[PDB]
Structure 1
Amino acid sequence: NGIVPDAGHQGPDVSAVNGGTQVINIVTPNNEGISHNQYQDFNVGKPGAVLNNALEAGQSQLAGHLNANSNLNGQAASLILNEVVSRNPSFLLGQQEVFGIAAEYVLSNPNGITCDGCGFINTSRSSLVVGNPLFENGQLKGYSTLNNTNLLSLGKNGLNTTGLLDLIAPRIDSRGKITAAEISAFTGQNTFSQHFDILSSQKPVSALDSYFFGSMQSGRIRIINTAEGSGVKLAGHHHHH
């Protein structure tokens, strides 16, 4: 049970199929088109996980044949926002697939996210946010990495997608191959709009250097570290003191 939904009204239904692949019947999208799913734990194992955004039965790459998601009510999600609300970090050790209608994907976990052999299938854009979503008056206003020093770690088995990729965290430590249509890595302690415009930045109490080793295969790479006194280190497979 790597994925454990919150017991409240934004907790989706989660089950597993043979091999261990988890299937998430995401919650009904709201008027903004956002399926806002809340979790006590969000972790993906080697067998992967499927987010069911399908209006009709069909074939999932990771799970096989699947039924439509009856939570949808005729309208698929535009954005699938997965928010870890507890203090548990997330480990993504396999692929995640949006089954059905392609959508944007966000995973927010201010406690940390580790990817190692992860990836995103049938997503137009996938964003990993070591931070929290910001809501005001019931609407998604953006995201915050303020007052946070936790890591977005990417391990030696890398991260693959053919959609856009955002890596949003106080700091990043990447050691593998990242493939995406475009890679945007925005680091430091920031507030963001829902589009990942940087709206404000804090000076951190201590340095927030990000480290990249491995490779990047993409059409465009953009890296912005807003933290004063910090930078982007391109090191080898180890970074010793």
Structure 2
Amino acid sequence: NGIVPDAGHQGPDVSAVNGGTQVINIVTPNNEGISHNQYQDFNVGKPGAVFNNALEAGQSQLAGHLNANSNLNGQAASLILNEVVSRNPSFLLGQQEVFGIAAEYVLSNPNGITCDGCGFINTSRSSLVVGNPLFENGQLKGYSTLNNTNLLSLGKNGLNTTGLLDLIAPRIDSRGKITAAEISAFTGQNTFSQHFDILSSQKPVSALDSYFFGSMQSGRIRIINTAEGSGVKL
């Protein structure tokens, strides 16, 4: 029970198959294609987790055979946005798979996110955001790390994906191998568009220092730090 959905309209259906792998029947996407899922707790263990973004039955890598997700009503998500709405931080200790149609993935948790041996399957882009999504008039407008000093931590067992990776947080502390098609890390207290264009920045009350130990196995790495003064240590 690492993943606990919110009790309201944006809480997805969450269950487990034998062996403990979590299966999330994501909520119906809006007209922009965004499935906005809210959680009281979001954690993934070694058994992993599967997001059902399928319009037809078939074979998932981590959870066996699954039906189509009835919640989709015939249109798959373009973006699976997972938002933790409580004060609980997230720990990602295994693989997350999008079953069915490949999608963009976001986990937002302003309380902190820790990856250690996590990874992403069948995602075009995966973004970890220690911050909150911003909505206006029911549409996703972007994200915010303003007034937040919490950490995106990546542990010794690293993070792997064949897709694009975004790491968005007030500060990042990475100690393992990050493997991705491209890595984009954006640190500081910022607001962002839906596509992680930086729209504004503010100077933190005290330093927000980020640390990258370990390695990065990617053909394209970008690190953008807006906290004037604060550093990027390697």
Which range, TM-score by smaller chain? over 0.9
Corresponding residue of 1:148: 148
Pairing 1:1-241 to 2, within 5 Å after superposition: 1-234=1-234
Q: Find the residue that maps to 1:71 and give its secondary structure.
A: helix
Deviation at 1:103, TM superposition (A): 0.2
CA distance in 1, matches of 2:146, 2:38: 20
- CA deviation profile, 1:86-141 (whole Å, cap 9, x unmatched): 00000000000000000000000000000000000000000000000000011100
Deviation at 1:166, TM superposition (A): 0.1
Q: Find the residue that maps to 2:229 and give its secondary structure.
A: coil
Identity over aligned pairs, percent:
100
- CA deviation profile, 1:47-88 (whole Å, cap 9, x unmatched): 000000001111111111111100011100000000000000
Deviation at 1:168, TM superposition (A): 0.2
Q: TM-score, normalised by structure 1?
A: 0.96
CA distance in 1, matches of 2:219, 2:32: 30
The alignment yields a C-alpha RMSD, in angstroms, of 0.5
Q: Find the residue that maps to 1:74 and give its secondary structure.
A: coil
Deviation at 1:161, TM superposition (A): 0.1
- Show structure 2 runs of 5+ residues with no match: none
CA distance in 2, matches of 1:17, 1:226: 43
Deviation at 1:229, TM superposition (A): 1.5
CA distance in 1, matches of 2:219, 2:105: 20
Q: TM-score, normalised by structure 2?
A: 0.99
- CA deviation profile, 1:185-237 (whole Å, cap 9, x unmatched): 00000000000000000000111110011110112000011001201001xxx
CA distance in 1, matches of 2:73, 2:219: 37
- Show structure 1 runs of 5+ residues with no match: 235-241
CA distance in 2, matches of 1:231, 1:59: 45
CA distance in 1, matches of 2:79, 2:59: 21
Q: Find the residue that maps to 1:207 and give its secondary structure.
A: coil
Q: What stretches of structure 1 move > 3 A for 4+ residues in a row? A: none
Deviation at 1:18, TM superposition (A): 1.2
Q: Find the residue that maps to 1:206 and give its secondary structure.
A: coil
